[PDB]
Each structure stands twice: as C-alpha cells, then as structure tokens.
Amino acid sequence: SETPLLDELEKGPWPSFVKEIKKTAELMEKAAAEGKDVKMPKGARGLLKQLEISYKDKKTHWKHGGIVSVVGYGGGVIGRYSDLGEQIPEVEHFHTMRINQPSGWFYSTKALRGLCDVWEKWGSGLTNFHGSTGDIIFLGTRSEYLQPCFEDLGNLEIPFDIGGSGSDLRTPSACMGPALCEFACYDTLELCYDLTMTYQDELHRPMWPYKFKIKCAGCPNDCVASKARSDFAIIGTWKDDIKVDQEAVKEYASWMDIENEVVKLCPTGAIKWDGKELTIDNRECVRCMHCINKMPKALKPGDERGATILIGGKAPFVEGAVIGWVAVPFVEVEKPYDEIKEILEAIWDWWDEEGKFRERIGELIWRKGMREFLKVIGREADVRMVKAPRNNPFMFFEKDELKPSAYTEELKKRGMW
C-alpha cells in the first residue's frame, strides 16, 4: 500500500473518514479523465499522502497561512499552506471556505446537489458536514479558485453565501426548534436567520477586537451547546405554569416509577406525585426541564415564552474557559426581535470602544465589571445574575450615592472624587 497506516482505519465498524478521502480521490480523478471540468482532480489524493506522512511523523505538516479572501469580504476563507508543497504540489495551497448553513441544517437535495457541483469544479471534493460553529466546510482549494467558486455559489438556483471567520460576527446557529420539537419556546430557526441577515456586514467584514458568536436554543436543554460555545447564548424559557395533562400522567403512572425517576430528581423539590394527581409549585421550579423530558405526552413549557440570555461563553484562551452566565433573565423573542438587536448593538459599540486586541466579551466584562456592562445594555442588577452575593466587602460606590461631606468637598476641591 502507499498508505499502510491509514489503511488500518478502513477496518472496524464505524464509517471510515479514510474511505471518504479515497472515494473522493478516485472519483475526482475519474471525472477529470472523462473530460469534465474539474480544476483540482488530485487534491484529495495529495491530502491522503500528507496525512499518511503525518501519521508516520506524529505531527502536523501544515504551517501558518497567508491571509486569503473573496473579493468584498474580509472573513470566511482560511488560508492553509502545506510544508510539503514541493514533495506534494497539489496541496501546496489547500484553503478552507466556510459556507453559511440554512438554520438547523435543513436541506433539500437540490440545494446539496448545487454545493457538490460547485465544489467538484473548483476544489478537492472533500467537505465537513458540518464545522463546529455550524458552517459547511469546503475543505481544500487554491487561491485563484476562491473568487470564481464564490461566483458560482451565488449564481446557483439555490444560492449559498460565505459564513464568518476572523474578528467578526460568526455564523449564528440554532437547534431544530419548532420545526421538529414540541419543547421549543421560540422560533430558533427564524431568529437565527433574521440575525444572520440583519448583520451580514458585521459577519462578512471583520471590524471588532475579536470574534463574537451567537447560538439559539429553543429551551433549557440547550441542544446547540450555546452556553459553552457562543458569547451570546439565547436560551428559550417561560415565565408561567407548566402545562399538566393529569390523565396522561396517570397513563405514565401505570408503568413508570414517577417517584424515583421524576419526583426525587427535580433539583428544587417543586413537583410532587401522590397516585391521584401531579402538583408543580411553579414558584419553586427552575425550569430545568427534567420532568417535561420525562413525560413529554403530559407536561409542557408554559405559555409566557421568551429567552434567557447567557453572556460570555468561550474556550480557555486568555483568562479561562467560560460557560456563559445570566445577563438577561427574560427577553421576548418576537420578530423583528428589536429588543435583542438593541442589546447586541449596545454590547458591540461598547466592546469595539473599550476592548483590547483579541479580548473576548466575557473577558472585557470581567475587566470592566458587571455594573458597566449592565449600564451599557440599560438593565438593572438582578439577584438571578449570581449564584451567591460577593464574599468580600470591597465594593465600589458611585459618587452620587455618597453623603455630602467636608471630605467629599475636599475631593471636589482637588479635582478627584
């Protein structure tokens, strides 16, 4: 074999990525031999060859990239250059194009077929469905092909724009929400789409201190992992009572250990069951969803719906990994979502003004404090923002909270205060 190490990974039950790579190589090579218009027939084979040498070496053979883009955009395409480009010229440039996905990754076959015809023509044939943020990944093309690839994408019957990269608004993403899910508290797919379109410019043309990510989750189960993987986590919730169908609960009671699998597992002891009727003390409930998850034919989210906004989620770099914390206990989610846009635009202006190079919003808030953040988004401090009040008495007081005194007059006299 030319690839004795990767060949080992064609064995075993799980579907092989090595088969994906080899299939692309054989079929691109075949298409080009048949006279079809394929610009990079050898891309996938070259990738295979480099991956094999990487496996033998136990190390990457990619280096830091030159910066590369389509005309009119500053983000969306990641330059990648092989350190093996003299040995394997066909992967000397191997750039990634991030192609914005439809909300919730819903496709028709005509849409996917258009993507495949374009990528077959201008790239390696290799793709990720999907990148972690959510984008389709066009994995491997040359600089001279990015623009005309982009032009074909745009002229498709069902067209696809480039997604986000660099110091911009990244491609927002959403859980399937109301398309499939009886738990959805708002229209995740619509909100995701509206934000993507509203902020095309912020996405395509990086202007900020660093990247900013938004993710939309229809309910507290958080099936897009928004609180860990987005700076601005929009997580559906409700304000009123859980809807309880008593006769469905009795249907459950007949086979399910409700006491042990539901009652005892509620974080707050808000939900009792006595054989006859189920009771929820909705004042004690924290909308963790477990009882609903457990009895979907019987229990639903209440009617006064909206979202909680969790702020600052990020990976470790600089100051530590963050699961986002409560910024906005409740906001309404009704098209055209002006209140959410208001909050976004306030944060962005403040962060563009104050942020250091490569400082995330989470870090900025840590550095400036929660009072400045809250004043920026024009909201008041709420106890739901903390797990506990502060464990030290070193509080800042604003000038106007102080009693007029000889000392405050001294401070005014000097030019401090």
């Binding site: 990974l9 092989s16 990457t60 990754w105 469905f129 789409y193 507290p220 969803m289 797990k387």
Partner: protein, 363 residues
C-alpha cells in the same frame, strides 16, 4: 451589474419537508421508537419518523450525492444534519423505515442509531464532536479524525442501541483552544504540549508583532528582548499552552514524542436535574500512537465502563461523582491522582465561581 454578495444562506423554510413546514411549531409529542428512529406526532394528526445515522463528518461530495439519491427515494428529497453531525431523514410511511435503514447501511456504510430515550431512561452514545487535527490544522497536538474512528470502533455497540443509563457525550479537541464544547463534555479528549517554545529570532523579527504575542501568554512567561528585537521565554513559567505559536510562527513548541492528549470528565451543558459544569482533568497525558491510539482508547473505555456499571438511571458522569465523591471516582475508574490535577491556572478570577452560569433560577 456586479458580483452578488451579502445575500446570506438560503432561507430554511424553503428547504423544509411539506409535512414539517405544515406542522411547524404545532407538535403534540415525540416518541423514541427504537435506536435511530424517532416518531413525531403533530396536532393535525400528521406523523413523521425522523431516522438518524452516524457519519464520519468529513464527507466526500460523492457520499453527499449518494445521500441525496437516498433522500429522493425515502424522504421526498429532504434531510438535515444534527448539532453532533449525525444525518437525519424524514419518513411519512412507517412501512419504509427499515428499507431506508438497510439501504443507508448498504450504500454509504452509515449506521442507524445516535438516539436516546429519557422516558424509558436508556441512552445511546451519540457521535463525537471534533475538529481538524492533522487533516487541516497548523496547531494540533493530536489527530482528530483518527482518534474518533479508533474510539467509535471500540464503543460502536453503544451507538446502535440504548445501552447506557444516562446521557454521556464524548468530545475531542486537537489543542487547548479547544474548538467545540469539549470544555463541557462527560468525557473530553484534549490535545496538549509538554515542552516550551524555542524562539526562532529571525522569524519573530520578520513576522511577529511582539507586544501582542507577549500579551497572548497567560503566565507572563514571555518578555520582549529589545536588544535583539525578539522575545525571551521564562521556561519556568511556561505550561506549554501553545497560544504564542497561534500568534507567532517563530514560537513553535511541538514535540512528536511529548505531545499527546489529556482526558477530562464531568462536563454538562443541559439544565436537567443539575447545573451545567466544565470538564475536569483526570488523566494528565497519553501519547500519540497512530493509527489506533491504543493507550488513549483504553482509558476512555475504562472510564465509560466504570461509570456505566455503577450509575443510576439518568445519572450522568458528573452526577455520579456528586453522589460518590472524587475519592471513589478514582478508585472505581482505577485512575491515579497526581499533583498535575491540582489546579494552578492563576489568571482566572474567583468571582466567576459566584456568577450564575445556568438558566436555572426561580421567578
């Protein structure tokens, strides 16, 4: 005229199955039929079955085309991917479900499964979220695709049946910038370095902006060296995070014999039963051993089996540990506790621990 730009993704509502478009936001309930198969019942009376398959994430355009032919045959030309990179089809005719599953299995080798059923309380292991590793990335400590394959080969039986007592997510990051939600996963595989960078002075001068490369170091182990127009590293403060190489091509720190992976455990994203949690290191290091990474796979499997054998229904790894304590976790998983696992990342503020990182609160 001119080239079209700023037009965005195609609008998803144009891409929905007619039954899904019709019943949008009007669902009565779902029911997990069997592994891989979820029945959805609308208020209208319509019933749709959502059929789920594992994928290697990296797809050939020719695989995509095959999946399209299959979608045209069984799901009226409609399909979706999930937020863990499984692929789903929509079937209105319940008598065609097995035909679909079998044809997917035959044509593309993608297995049906990836599901779980909270109601009965039996869970499959779904797909592993992961990144580019050596296939495309310039900062990996480990490979992504090779490891996911070697782990999923060993744990395959857990994907295709509902054999676990609670949810368990396995996630992989090829370096510490930990692309994905690896930082909040029941089991996380994270690539690390263990050796400090050696400044290439000529490359730093040519290509690196010094003050921002210096400011990228979380330990303040980098200082400017004005005399030689470069950077100096205090190796005694460096913990090999690699952030300086992200910033600067003259700061490589890769060592093929000492790069490897840490194993972390006990993240949680959902609110169900207990608050979300960041994952925690329980194995400091395992080497890269391509193509099968036997040492790393052995530890992942050892940790999963130990939890599965002792866990109550619905009790995910962290909740198991809430019950047993870390003392028993280490015994039962048979892992060694060393000084490495005592946190020393100083820059993070204590006050963050006092913030509510959850949507759980009372009205």
């Amino acid at each position: 005229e001119g080239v079209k730009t700023d037009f965005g993704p195609p609008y998803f509502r144009d891409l929905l199955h007619p039954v899904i478009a019709k019943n949008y936001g009007k669902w009565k309930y779902h029911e997990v039929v069997k592994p891989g198969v979820i029945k959805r019942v609308a208020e209208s009376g319509d019933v749709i079955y959502v059929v789920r398959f594992g994928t290697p994430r990296l797809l050939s355009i020719y695989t995509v085309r095959e999946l399209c032919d299959i979608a045209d045959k069984y799901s009226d030309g409609y399909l979706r991917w999930t937020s863990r990179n499984n692929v789903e089809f929509f079937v209105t005719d319940e008598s065609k479900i097995d035909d679909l599953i079998n044809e997917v299995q035959e044509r593309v080798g993608f297995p049906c499964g990836g599901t779980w059923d909270a109601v009965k309380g039996e869970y499959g292991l779904s797909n592993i979220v992961h990144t580019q590793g050596w296939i495309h990335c310039h900062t990996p400590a480990i490979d992504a695709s090779g490891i996911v394959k070697a782990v999923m080969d060993e744990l395959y039986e857990y994907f295709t049946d509902h054999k676990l007592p609670a949810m368990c997510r396995i996630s992989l990051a090829c370096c510490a910038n930990m692309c994905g939600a690896v930082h909040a996963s029941d089991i996380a595989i994270v690539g690390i370095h263990r050796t400090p960078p050696i400044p290439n002075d000529e490359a730093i001068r040519k290509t690196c902006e010094i003050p921002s490369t210096v400011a990228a170091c979380p330990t303040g182990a980098l200082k400017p060296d004005m005399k030689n127009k470069t950077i100096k590293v205090d190796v005694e403060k460096c913990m090999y995070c690699g952030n300086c190489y992200t910033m600067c091509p003259g700061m490589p720190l890769f060592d093929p014999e000492n790069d490897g992976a840490a194993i972390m455990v006990g993240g949680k994203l959902s609110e169900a039963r207990r608050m979300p949690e960041l994952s925690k290191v329980v194995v400091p290091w395992v080497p890269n051993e391509p193509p099968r990474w036997p040492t790393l796979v052995k530890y992942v499997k050892q940790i999963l089996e130990a939890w599965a054998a002792n866990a109550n229904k619905h009790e995910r790894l962290i909740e198991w540990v809430d019950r047993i304590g870390w003392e028993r976790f280490f015994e039962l998983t048979g892992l060694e506790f060393t000084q490495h696992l005592i946190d020393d990342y100083r820059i993070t503020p204590y006050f963050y621990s006092e913030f509510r990182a959850s949507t759980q609160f009372k009205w």
